[PDB]
Amino acid sequence: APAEILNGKEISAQIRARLKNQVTQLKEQVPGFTPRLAILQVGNRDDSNLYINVKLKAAEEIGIKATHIKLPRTTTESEVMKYITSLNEDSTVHGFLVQLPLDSENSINTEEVINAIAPEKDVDGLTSINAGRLARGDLNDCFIPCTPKGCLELIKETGVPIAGRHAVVVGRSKIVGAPMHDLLLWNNATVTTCHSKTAHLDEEVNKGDILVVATGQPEMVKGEWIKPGAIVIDCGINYVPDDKKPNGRKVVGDVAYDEAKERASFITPVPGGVGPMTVAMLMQSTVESAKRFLE
Template sequence: MAKRLLSVTSRCIALLRQRQRPFSDSRGQILDGKAIASSIRKNLKKEISDLKSKTDSKFGPCLAVIQVGHREDSNVYVRNKLKAAAEIGMETRSIKLPNAVGEAEVVDAIDELNRRNDVNGILLQLPLDVLQSVDTDYCINRIHPQKDVDGLTAVNSGRLARGEMGGTVIPCTPRGCLELIERTGTDIAGSNAVVIGRSKIVGSPMRDLLQNRNATVTVCHSKTKDMQDMVRRADIIVVAARQPQMVKGDWLKPGAIVIDCGINDIKDATKSKGYRLVGDVDYESCKPVASWITPVPKGVGPMTIAMLLQNTLECAKRQLAD
């Protein structure tokens, strides 16, 4: 009887350990950001439609984007954001300022949108393409925190760093990365996570989000020593280093989740444009080692736009409640 009890107990403990194992033994599963983002946008479209019907069509979440200058990459990003917003029934406003403007003109445009009740979210497209000196941080912090859909004001970033999540707007790319990690079914709590890069837009808020989920987080950057050894101990790796194909497969712990925020173009004579897009992760060498990995493109990029729309809707709902 005692032996049978011991055997049953041993099997129960083994089963419990198996269920608690947070990381998959499978390899090379692709986190399709494009498909996941499409699903999120579909849900947002339905939610906006339902809210409009309940408020006699008076509720129309509105995203305003301010673009300074004429950078071609910014033109593409703004166009994609406004198109995605319109496709889910969100109102949009596009404010384009010439690159000759000064800080006062940028602030005036922000203040005007802050005052408008029919604008729920304000995004200042970065980087600013200006001919004279403009304090980007000052301009960002002129955006009302409740309309800061990029989550970059000192108020929102400070609340996130303190773990005060209620009503805090989370930066779009880190929020998209977290959504992708959660889609794997991984138990983030107790995991070892490495974030490569410490920018205000991706690295630092990503650290805060993972810590808020009870991961143990290490932030690596250009001055980090023995970065490869740190990465090899990580269950979750988020890379935003702006270094093409920097992270190699032999850096990884087998079964790690790899989220690649980078997008870089490298020369490729086989392509009609003479280049191809790659991330900060060497996809081909990392894919066989990782349990889950994001491709570039169609990984983090589409999730960033989906989270921008999610943030705008949430800001609009909070303003409607007020």
């Protein structure tokens, strides 16, 4: 009785398809309405360009107007701030994000930059105000960072109710671990947060009916740790040289998939699990923002 596989690629395809239909219907229901997203970029990093293009492409297929603002490396902190303020004030923009890391020749305080974003437009959900709302249970209108948001979607796809279940979160970062706990707690699970200072991590993990791992430590969570029947969600993206792969490298998660799939009732593969969910979540946050503005 091996674990059922949570196909993030197929699930995200369904999500993006449904969001397109939603967007179409909003535009027809309220003529003239244009859900708009804006991505602010500083510099010209190769990985950022790629990531940005993927986002803008998903947005245009869903029917969301995606605006890309690419500022030069020479940009100073004050200029980046002026754009953020202007984006905040632009009533045609429903949500926007600052693609990190900033690529500038000058010192720019990333945190100050990020926290200048109006909470109501913060689709990536990383501002302190937004983290604060999420952390305290304002799940009704706050923004949820794309990775933990996609993880909750996957957990819900299983059909197994979260309330009352013991969920374990390995990792406590601002991008995944922290907000992941918030989601699970406010979905009524008894959450236990683990990190690098956790003793007997194996025994801790073995208590999780729901397990979300976000450590960056390739395959550390062995299958023996997994509680029989648990829902395993692996956010890890670790590259390993493998000449048998088309591009000479394989992607492994933070969980030992092969042995963990024999224990879990549901597990996210790597690649093809949490990763493909990412862009859809941003698109979902963007539509949520647009609907709230529209109301």
